[PDB]
Amino acid sequence: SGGGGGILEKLGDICFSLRYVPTAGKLTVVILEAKNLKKMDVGGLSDPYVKIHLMQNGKRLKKKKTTIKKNTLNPYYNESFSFEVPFEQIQKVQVVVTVLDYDKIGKNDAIGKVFVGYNSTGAELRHWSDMLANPRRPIAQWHTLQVEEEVDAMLA
Ligand SMILES: [Sr+2]
C-alpha cells in the first residue's frame, strides 16, 4: 500500500531486474527497457541513457551508466551492472535509477528517476522486498519515473 508519487507526472516508465546473493554480497541490476519517455529534444524525441547509483545516507557510493540510445522514447538496453553490498548492509542502501537525455553540450537533463531499497515505498518497496525474499532469483519489474525534485528530496 502507498507510494506512487510519480504516477500522474507522465515522464515514462523503466523496467529493470534486481538480484541479490547474500553469501557473496552481490547485487545485480539489469536495465531492460524504458517506455513512454517524455519528449526532451525540440523538434525530436529523446537520446536516453540510464544512470544507476548506489546510495546510503545521502551519499553516492558508486555510479554506473548505460550506453546512449538515439532518437527514441522507448529504448531497449539489456545492460547489466553489479555492486558489492555485504549482507549486513543490504537493508540500508538505495539503488537509484535515472533516465536522462543525452546532449553533447550542456548538463544532461533528467527525464525522471526512481529508487528502491531503504525508505522506498509502493511498487519500489515491493520490488526490493521481492528481491530480498528470493535470494539468487532475478526479479524484473516496471516502475513509473518521478520528477528529480521529489526523488532527490527523499534521498537527501
Ligand atoms: Sr537529446
Swiss-Prot record:
Residues that bear Phosphoserine: S80, S82
Result, substituting N108K: Slows synaptic vesicle fusion kinetics and exocytosis
Protein residues bound to Ca(2+) 5: D41, D101, D103, D109
Annotated phenotype, changing D103E: Fails to relocalize to nerve terminals after stimulation of neurotransmitter release
Subcellular location: Cytoplasmic vesicle, Secretory vesicle membrane; Cytoplasmic vesicle, Secretory vesicle, Synaptic vesicle membrane; Cytoplasmic vesicle, Secretory vesicle, Chromaffin granule membrane; Cytoplasm
Signal peptide (from-to): none
Domain C2: 10-143
A GO CC term attached to the entry: glutamatergic synapse
Binding site for Ca(2+) 4: D41, D47, D101, D103
Effect of mutating M40K: Fails to localize at nerve terminals
Swiss-Prot/TrEMBL keywords: Calcium, Cytoplasm, Cytoplasmic vesicle, Differentiation, Glycoprotein, Lipoprotein, Membrane, Metal-binding, Palmitate, Phosphoprotein, Repeat, Synapse, Transmembrane, Transmembrane helix
UniProt keyword annotation of Repeat present: yes
PTM info: Glycosylated.
Main location: membrane
Expression (tissue specificity): Expressed in the brain (at protein level). Predominantly expressed in rostral, phylogenetically younger brain regions, and in some endocrine tissues.
Any one GO molecular function term: syntaxin binding
One of the GO BP terms on file: detection of calcium ion
Subunit relationships: Homotetramer. Heterodimer; heterodimerizes with SYT2 in presence of calcium. Interacts with SCAMP5. Interacts with STON2. Forms a complex with SV2B, syntaxin 1 and SNAP25. Interacts with SV2A, SV2B and SV2C. Interacts with RIMS1. Interacts with PRRT2. Interacts with DNAJC5 in a phosphorylation-dependent manner. Interacts (via N-terminus) with RAB3A. Interacts with SYT12. Interacts with calmodulin. Interacts with DNM1 (via C-terminal proline-rich domain (PRD)); this interaction facilitates vesicle fission during clathrin-mediated endocytosis (CME). (Microbial infection) Interacts with C.botulinum neurotoxin type B (BoNT/B, botB). Has lower affinity for BoNT/B than Syt2; mutating its residues to match those in Syt2 increases its affinity.
Family per record: Belongs to the synaptotagmin family.
Function: Calcium sensor that participates in triggering neurotransmitter release at the synapse. May have a regulatory role in the membrane interactions during trafficking of synaptic vesicles at the active zone of the synapse. It binds acidic phospholipids with a specificity that requires the presence of both an acidic head group and a diacyl backbone. A Ca(2+)-dependent interaction between synaptotagmin and putative receptors for activated protein kinase C has also been reported. It can bind to at least three additional proteins in a Ca(2+)-independent manner; these are neurexins, syntaxin and AP2. (Microbial infection) Receptor for C.botulinum neurotoxin type B (BoNT/B, botB); interaction is improved in the presence of gangliosides. BoNT/B toxin binds to the membrane proximal vesicular domain of Syt1 (residues 32-51).
Domain remarks: The first C2 domain mediates Ca(2+)-dependent phospholipid binding. The second C2 domain mediates interaction with SV2A and probably with STN2.
Protein name from the UniProt record: Synaptotagmin-1
Organism (species): Rattus norvegicus (Rat)
